[PDB]
C-alpha cells in the first residue's frame, strides 16, 4: 500500500505524512521499519492533508523523521485459535515468553463492532460452576459481568484458577487471562504457578491463554491488551460455539493508562483528572461481551479502588456495567474456608425469582437471613456471654454455623495444601442441599462435620468419619 515519511516525533505521538492520494482510515495499524524491531502505531485522528496522529504501542526511541511507513489496511491483527493457548503474548500478538513465533491458521483484528440488537443477551442465562457460594448467592451468568474485589496473593490466584478448571468440565471451554498494568516479575510467577496447578500444559494445548501488558510498554499497550484477549474468546464463540471466561486485572490501571491516551492526542483529560471518553470506551468493551446464539464470552473484571472510595468516577462507571460482585476477604481464609468468598457480600442483580426460578431465590433469601440474624445476635451474645443465650436465639446460631462450614470446597486448585480431593458442585445440586438443612433434617449431624465438603452426597461421608 501507500507510503510516507514520518513528519513528527513529539512524545510517543508520531505524525506521518503520506504521498498525496489519501490517508489511512481511523483505527488502522501502521508498521515502521527500524532496528528496534517494528513499532505498530494506531491512527486516532486525521489532521488532514494526508497526515495522521497516532498513539504508540512500543517505546518511542530509535525513530527519525524520514523513516518510510507502511499501511496494513486495518487494525492490529492478533492470532486466534487453539494453537495460542498457554503462551504469553504482548499487545502485537507475539511472544514475550520466547517459545517461538506465536502463529495460528487465522488472525483477527483487535477492534471489532459489537453484535446486533437481536444477537445480544436478550433472555436470562445461567453459567454453572463448581463453587456453592457463587452458584447460590450470586449466580454467574452468561454475558455476565462480575467485578472481583480484594487483594492479590491471599486467594485471588486460587479463585481464578478454579473457575478456568470448572469451565473445561462444563463445556470444553477456554479462558484468556488478560493482565493490564502487569509487573514482569509477577508475570513469570503466574505462568509457572499456572503450569503447576494443571491449567497450562507444556505439551500441546492448554486451557487459559495469557495476555500480559507490561508497564515498560507505552499506555496504548496497556489499553489494547483487553481487546487483544477478547478477540481470542470470540473466535471460540462465533466459529466453534464454545463458552469462555475472560478476566481483566485491575480496572484502575485500564483507567490510568486511558487518561494518558486522551491527554496526549490533543484532547483534554477532564473527568476528575481522567479521560472524558471513559464511559464510551467501557461501552465498546463490555457490549461485545455477550451471549450470541452459538456461544458466549462472560467477563470477570477486577475493581481496584483509588483511595477507598466507591463515590469516584472510575468506580462509579464500572458499578453500572457490573451485574454481580464477588467479595474475597482474608477473614474467611483464616477460619480455614477456601473459596474466600463472603456470603454476606455475595450479590447479583441476576439473583431473582424469575431468573433462577422461584425455589433458588427463596432458599437464597433464607441462607442470607440466617447468617444476618446470627451476626445481630452475636454482638450482644459475646458481650453478655454465651450462656445468656435464648432457646430461640441458639436455634439461629446453630443453623448458621452448619451453613458456614458446609460452603467450603476442598477444590482441586488448593488441593495440595489441605490434602483433600477436589470438588465441583453444580448449581442445581447446591440448591437441593440447602433445602434439607432449612427443614433441619441434618440437625442430628454435628456442626463441625460439615467441614470441607461440597454437595448433599459429600457430607454423608464426613459425618461417619467424625464419629469414626
Amino acid at each position: 500500500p501507500i507510503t510516507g515519511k514520518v513528519t513528527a516525533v513529539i512524545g510517543a505521538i508520531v505524525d506521518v505524512h503520506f504521498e498525496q492520494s489519501e490517508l489511512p482510515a481511523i483505527l488502522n495499524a501502521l508498521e515502521i521499519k527500524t532496528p528496534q524491531g517494528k513499532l505498530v502505531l494506531e491512527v486516532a485522528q486525521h489532521l488532514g492533508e494526508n497526515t495522521v496522529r497516532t498513539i504508540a504501542m512500543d517505546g518511542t526511541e530509535g525513530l527519525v523523521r524520514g523513516e518510510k511507513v507502511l499501511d496494513t489496511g486495518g487494525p492490529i491483527s492478533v492470532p486466534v485459535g487453539r494453537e495460542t493457548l498457554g503462551r504469553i503474548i504482548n499487545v502485537i500478538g507475539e511472544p514475550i515468553d520466547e517459545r517461538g513465533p506465536i502463529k495460528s491458521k487465522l488472525r483477527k483484528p483487535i477492534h471489532a463492532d459489537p453484535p446486533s440488537f437481536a444477537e445480544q443477551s436478550t433472555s436470562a442465562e445461567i453459567l454453572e460452576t463448581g463453587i456453592k457460594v457463587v452458584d447460590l448467592l450470586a449466580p454467574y451468568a452468561r454475558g455476565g459481568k462480575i467485578g472481583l474485589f480484594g487483594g492479590a496473593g491471599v486467594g485471588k490466584t486460587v479463585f481464578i484458577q478454579e473457575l478456568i478448571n470448572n469451565i473445561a468440565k462444563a463445556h470444553g471451554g477456554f479462558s484468556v487471562f488478560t493482565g493490564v498494568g502487569e509487573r514482569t516479575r509477577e508475570g513469570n510467577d503466574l505462568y509457572r504457578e499456572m503450569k503447576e496447578t494443571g491449567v497450562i500444559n507444556l505439551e500441546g494445548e492448554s486451557k487459559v491463554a495469557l495476555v500480559f501488558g507490561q508497564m515498560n510498554e507505552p499506555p496504548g499497550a496497556r489499553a489494547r491488551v483487553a481487546l487483544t484477549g477478547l478477540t481470542i474468546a470470540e473466535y471460540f464463540r462465533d466459529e466453534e460455539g464454545q463458552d469462555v471466561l475472560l478476566f481483566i486485572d485491575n480496572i484502575f490501571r485500564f483507567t490510568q493508562a486511558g487518561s494518558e491516551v486522551s491527554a496526549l492526542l490533543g484532547r483534554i483529560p477532564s473527568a476528575v483528572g481522567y479521560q472524558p471518553t471513559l464511559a464510551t470506551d467501557m461501552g465498546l468493551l463490555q457490549e461485545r461481551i455477550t451471549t450470541t446464539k452459538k456461544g458466549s464470552v462472560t467477563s470477570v473484571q477486577a475493581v481496584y479502588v483509588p483511595a477507598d472510595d466507591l463515590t469516584d468516577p472510575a468506580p462509579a462507571t464500572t458499578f453500572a456495567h457490573l451485574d454481580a460482585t464477588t467479595v474475597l476477604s482474608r477473614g474467611i481464609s483464616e477460619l480455614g474456608i477456601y473459596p474466600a468468598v463472603d456470603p454476606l457480600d455475595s450479590k447479583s442483580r441476576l439473583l431473582d425469582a424469575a431468573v433462577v426460578g422461584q425455589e433458588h431465590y427463596d432458599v437464597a433469601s433464607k441462607v442470607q437471613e440466617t447468617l444476618q440474624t446470627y451476626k445481630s445476635l452475636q454482638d450482644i451474645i459475646a458481650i453478655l456471654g454465651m450462656d445468656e443465650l435464648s432457646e430461640q436465639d441458639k436455634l439461629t446460631v446453630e443453623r448458621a454455623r452448619k451453613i458456614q462450614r458446609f460452603l467450603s470446597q476442598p477444590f482441586a486448585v488448593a488441593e495440595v495444601f489441605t490434602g483433600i480431593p477436589g470438588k465441583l458442585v453444580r448449581l442445581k445440586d447446591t440448591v437441593a442441599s440447602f433445602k434439607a438443612v432449612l427443614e433441619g433434617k441434618y440437625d442430628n449431624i454435628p456442626e463441625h462435620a460439615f467441614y470441607m465438603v461440597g454437595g448433599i452426597e459429600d457430607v454423608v461421608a464426613k459425618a461417619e468419619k467424625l464419629a469414626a
Binding site: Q45, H46, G48
Partner: protein, 71 residues
Amino acid sequence: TKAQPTEVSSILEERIKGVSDEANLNETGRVLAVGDGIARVFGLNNIQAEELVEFSSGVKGMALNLEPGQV
C-alpha cells in the same frame, strides 16, 4: 500575520491557479480534519443552521458552527 484554517495547501493551490477559487464550496464540502468525534468540512457556505449533511461514507452529521471558510 494571523493564522487561519484557510491556509490549507490543497485549497490554496487551486485558488491561485486561476480566477477560480472552487465551486466545491457551494452545496458541497470536502472533509479535512476528522476524529475526536468532531469533524471539519471545508466550504458548505450555502448551508442552513442546524442542517443535516450526509457524507459519502454512510455517516451523516449536524452542522454546529458555520464559520467563514469551514463548517
